[PDB]
């Protein structure tokens, strides 16, 4: 019963389709994301 964030350096990002809904995506210093 619970939840916890991921471990790829992790971050949370808006995805633009009011505000933006944010999802978990891991980027290091490099501007990538996975």
């Amino acid at each position: 019963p619970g939840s916890s964030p991921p471990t790829c350096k992790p971050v949370h990002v808006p995805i633009q389709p009011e505000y933006y809904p944010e999802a978990w995506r891991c980027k290091c210093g490099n501007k990538l994301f996975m």
Partner: protein, 540 residues
Amino acid sequence: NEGKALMAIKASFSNVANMLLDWDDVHNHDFCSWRGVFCDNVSLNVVSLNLSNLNLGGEISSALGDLMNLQSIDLQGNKLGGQIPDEIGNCVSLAYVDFSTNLLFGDIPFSISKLKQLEFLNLKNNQLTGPIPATLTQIPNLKTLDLARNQLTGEIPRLLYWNEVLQYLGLRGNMLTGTLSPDMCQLTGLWYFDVRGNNLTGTIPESIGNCTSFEILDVSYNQITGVIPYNIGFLQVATLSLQGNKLTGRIPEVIGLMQALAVLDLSDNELTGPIPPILGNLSFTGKLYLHGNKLTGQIPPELGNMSRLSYLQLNDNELVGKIPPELGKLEQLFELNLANNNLVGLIPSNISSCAALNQFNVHGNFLSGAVPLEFRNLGSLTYLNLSSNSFKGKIPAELGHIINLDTLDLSGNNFSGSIPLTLGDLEHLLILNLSRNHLNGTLPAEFGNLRSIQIIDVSFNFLAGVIPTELGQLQNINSLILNNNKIHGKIPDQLTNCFSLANLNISFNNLSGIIPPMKNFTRFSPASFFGNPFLCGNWV
């Protein structure tokens, strides 16, 4: 011969003759070099078609049915019209369909079912009517279905919920009745469930917790009722948006253990009961929105433990108690909205430790005591609303060096003492409301330096001295309200040069002289100046 269908496609189109780089059956019989139409290396037939965002403003011609090797069609952003012709159900090779940001109406054809290879269907931003055709779970390859911002009707097809593949389900904005079915947790690959802005009824299914595959769950702004189930605490959701529904009951404590939450929104609901202190352990969440509810209790200091929280909104509730100083631990806090509650006590001196703090809104409560000066350490403070409270003591002069202030609302209080001269140095200030207070002293003149000011209100105070003559400098001011003060002297003529000033009220003073009528100052004659005895005009 697919060129023929491309021509008929070109025929019933917008006045594209402009940008469609040469489609023609006159000379060029090579339709794999034409703008926006791609052919594959092998058989030289159309595979991908990108006409995105050209404003081609036509209808989708029927000849689309003749393009067989067609895999992908992007007609996005072309201001296109008509309905989607039924004959699209011909090209079974079709895979990607983006009709985004067009103007298409009418039912989605049933022939859409005949496209086995179709895995991406985006129809967002259109005028399409009809229901969601139940013949869409017949397509086995479908991963992404975006129908958001349309006008579709009828319930959500029950069979669709049984799809392991589906990933993005966006129904946001239609008028879809029906209820959330528990079968919702049989979508094992979906990571974005978006039913917002529908006419949906029903309850939260109790099996909602068995949906660990969900990252964003947005059910906001529907007529959904019921309590928030315990199972909600198993969700791996990054964003959980429950705001603007009719959910009753309390806030389940088990959401405390839901640290995958980035944004938790429960606002505008009918939830009651206290704020659960356990919420102190979701230290990765950024937005906490709890406003508009019937919540009671105090503000638990454990919210100071949410390190990565930037927006706290608790307004429009029934909370009580002092403001806890542990919010001073919130070094990443941006917006603090505590409005329309029943809080009492002081503003803590340890709250001036959140540098990044744009807006601070405590209007409509019962706070007491003076104003702490360490507000001078909030340099990024753009919004300060303290209205309708019992604040005492002078206006700290230090409120003038918060240079980017855009709005400063101190009305409805018991403020005393003369007005700080240092209030002159807010160039970016627009709205200064000091009304309904107890201010001593006279009216300071540095009010001429508010270049961008739109609205000045010092009404219902004890100000004295003459109406300052510099007040004609403000070009952006549309409202000047100085009712119920002891201001004497005459009315300066320079009050005419306020171009934007269409709303004025200087009644109820000892004002003397005439009404200067340089410009059209006859619109504000009768009512605006009523209460002054020594003013030249026809009234008592």
